[model samples]
Target chain A: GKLKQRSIKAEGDGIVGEGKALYNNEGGRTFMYAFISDKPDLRVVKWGGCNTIELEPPRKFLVDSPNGAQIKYLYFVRNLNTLRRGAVLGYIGATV
Target chain B: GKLKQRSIKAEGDGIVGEGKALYNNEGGRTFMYAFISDKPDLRVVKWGGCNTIELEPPRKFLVDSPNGAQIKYLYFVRNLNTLRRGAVLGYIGATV
Candidate 1:
């Protein structure tokens, strides 16, 4: 519940909430790899796009002061797929 | 004994077991952000340079075919201290 530094740009993948929340290879998410740092909650979970399970206009990222939390686990894909939701893409904000 | 390891490099501290093996503010760690891929083991733990880590020359990463491993959940900062080491750095192999 922090990710709001504005912009740093560099790492590209700075807030996959750490890692294992990524999914790319083209097909859905074309680009992503956060940067700006200070370390906040940094989390993501939408499983939308196709691998549905929760997100039904509720694949929220976070930041509501409370009742807020996107994902923590359950988003697999290495031989097939797990993490859904347009795959994912967000350098800092706006349509990420 | 089945947690083998290998790397291509691109996520810098990726070997941080996929996440959380990076440390840098420019004091000890110079730079890192791995960039080769295959995905194997990928772990690190040295905390050296002047942070009072368990790296008495044991700040190893991982990959031995057996009895091989380094770190998993540690390395903190932003407030005071929790991970004691020169911080971290490794774009992939060597001198990271």
Candidate 2:
């Protein structure tokens, strides 16, 4: 799907779990933008890579890859204070 | 000036000082991008606002203003442990 916007929420370990990983099974270059809200400390983890990105609020940035090899995740930490349900952490927009 | 890339450095309080504040005398819409390098706890401060952004590593993002009203700065903080001379904190590109 192209131009799809996914609402992301913090699910445990402060990790953003959408039931499954993002762009793991996709093809082609995927350009994604994550618009983070609130004031939760966030981290972007790339699947199959050692590179991890931490974000600052108003964290609106664009990331793209030649293929879906750059699988990324939005994570929080294992802090219970910042964990909750239906708490909208951020929104991810992807063009795949 | 349009499409001018500026190298930014931390000049205390982790605040980014380019001799003088940015876009304070500019006009029209100004779009700017800041690419942060290394692993330093960083913060972005708006010149005339209370919205301060704290960034995590691999921090790269774009910010713009309708009339340079969104004057922003890349700050490191007051901790001397992370401050250094000639230490390139990030690069900023602007279209003004």
Candidate 3:
């Protein structure tokens, strides 16, 4: 299967910060996450400092900030399999 | 779906170090990776310094070590779906 590109924007409903849901995909199993470093609103990014890269029922990929600051950033999701599950892939937020 | 636990031992064919193949899973789209931090013989752990958490057609998860040190460690793989693909997941190693 071909890898598809997916993402969430910073300007969407809430401020881009901790506990923000990066994705909550139920259609396919997620494979990769690329931090968009070249974007104009580049923010310092960290992961798994105080949280696990949560996946399973929620299929979440939570990012951590150094000082718990709300900032804008871009991310990409790719390589979703067509396999269906009653439980959707959860990409939720966790803390730093 | 239930997440399954899988792993590779450090004492297997070669010394655990950079560019070592962590897994080559094909039956599932890999979801989460846990660095076995509590296990004895722990080495300085790193990721994607110059390598990627690789998946697709090979399903490889390569870990990086600072100072290019090879040491013993444990890793876990979970949430593999039964979807089949002609192309296997490729998990290969790249350098720091």
Candidate 4:
């Protein structure tokens, strides 16, 4: 229904830059992660579908090496579900 | 997973304008209303679905106008539940 966009500047050498996308639903909220790269490699690290039946605030998953390499530019897509079917309430985005 | 756009224009005179869209998971959020026009009158509202354990943020529903009258445009649709069957989490919308 709503889409939020955000951007973050990378500091630190080996630490690289990180990008995250999140979706909120009646079941709970899900998260996805991708590391920035010259070519921009995107991958999903965590999702809400499997975790909804478990608990609250959900848990955060760490994106590892391969998932954390290169990283110069990061793009995040959120609340992907409603894009095709329904609508959104609102959207908010920020950088970290 | 992304959608956000907004526009507003009008200076009240008994006022007439209404539009809303919302959807968030972890199960919580509701309400809708419409009234405006020389023949403009619309109404539709829904709480959530029946559930498993007695959800948190559950229970509560109310909307009434003069039941409020003399207004314009109102549109909204949310969560409806993960556009798909799995992925979940997130919140969307606000308007009165």
* Best by the lDDT measure: 2
Q: Candidates' TM-scores?
A: 0.17, 0.19, 0.20, 0.26
Encode model 4's per-residue lDDT on B1-96: one tens digit a residue: 222223322222334333332223332452221111221223333234632111122112233457565433323222334342111112222223
Error at B80, model 4, angstroms: 18
Lowest lDDT 10-residue stretch of candidate 2 chain A? A82-91
Best by DockQ: 4
Q: Note the DockQ of each predicted structure.
A: 0.03, 0.03, 0.03, 0.09
TM-score of 2: 0.19
A best-first ranking of the candidates according to their TM-score comes to 4, 3, 2, 1
- The lDDT for every candidate, in the order shown, is 0.26, 0.31, 0.29, 0.29
Across A1-96, the per-residue lDDT of candidate 1 in tens digits comes to: 011122211111244333333223345343322222223333333333533212111122432225554432222222222222212221112221
Off by over 4 Å in 4: A1-17, A28-39, A47-96, B1-73, B76-96
Per-residue alpha-carbon lDDT of candidate 3 for residues A1-96, written as tens digits (9 for 90 to 100): 222233423321222433233333236543333333222322322331332232222232334568664343333323334332111221111011
lDDT of 1: 0.26
Q: Which stretches of candidate 1 lie over 4 Å from their true place?
A: A1-21, A24-50, A55-96, B1-21, B25-49, B55-96
Proportion of true inter-chain contacts also present in candidate 4: 0.13
Q: How would you encode candidate 4's per-residue C-alpha lDDT over A1-96 as one tens digit per residue?
A: 223333323323234434433333443543322223232333333232432111122223222265664324333333334432222222222111
The 10-residue segment of model 2 chain B with minimum total lDDT is B82-91
Off by over 4 Å in 2: A1-96, B1-4, B11-29, B45-96
Candidate 2 local lDDT, residue A9: 40
Fraction of true contacts reproduced, model 2? Answer: 0.00
